[PDB]
Ligand SMILES: [Zn+2]
């Protein structure tokens with residue numbers, strides 16, 4: 001059986017990396033069973049990469065993600081699969097966000113509309129470079145629609161840097177490669193929508209894409225360096241950071257940067273290679289827009305105080 005083939009591999013890794021006997025014991029190739037895999041990733045990491053540096057991500061998240069990556073390899077190699085149970089929990093977004101200067105596109109594949117954020121002594125916060133989902137060009141300041149991809153940006157330029165960063169970061173890693181480093185390896189689910197059979201929840205249905213500034217302290221050095229991977233963040237002091245779907249209802253502490261995310265994948269490939277002869281062909285789904293992703297907003301009409309007793313005049 002394929003299952004057995006999977007069990008064999010999973011088992012090797014597990015004994016070799018001394019995973020808690022309990023985990024081992026209660027392990028089948030069940031889709032929801034990622035723990036056991038994370039532990040493998042956890043110990044190995046340790047042993048072969050202690051003091052790993054993570055930019056804007058948490059350890060749980062990283063290991064966890066490594067866990068899914070393992071799970072995919074495991075599954076592919078064994079040739080087992082579970083319908084509606086994609087392992088990686090990520091997709092490949094062909095963001096055409098670094099093609100036109102000052103131009104960003106949202107998940108819809110549509111260019112993001114620019115809109116200023118003021119409208120009102122007071123404490124007026126201005127956002128002249130904000131960008132929104134075409135389907136939100138009508139909504140008030142940062143309120144998402146029922147068609148929105150839930151993708152918003154308060155600082156277009158920033159966000160473009162981050163996108164540029166990832167691109168340059170990937171080029172660094174993969175200089176010669178028949179493919180335009182236009183894809184963005186992004187997670188489609190966080191802790192909240194981790195399981196297919198999950199309590200539907202309002203708001204953003206995908207992890208939030210948020211660019212974090214690096215500059216802050218990073219602009220305090222540059223010229224010495226030679227390492228392409230380093231140069232990238234330096235020429236583009238901003239990173240793409242994915243958090244919870246909604247950082248009301250549920251909320252998780254999911255946090256991982258694009259690079260750390262791409263690094264978790266790479267790292268799983270090495271771990272696999274240090275244990276298995278050949279690396280199986282692992283396919284991260286291409287991102288395709290769908291309703292499944294549409295922002296779930298609840299729209300309720302709100303009352304307004306009228307100093308009147310009765311609604312109308314007669
Ligand atoms: Zn959109």
Ligand SMILES: [Zn+2]
Nearest residue numbers: 190192244252
């Ligand atoms: Zn979440």
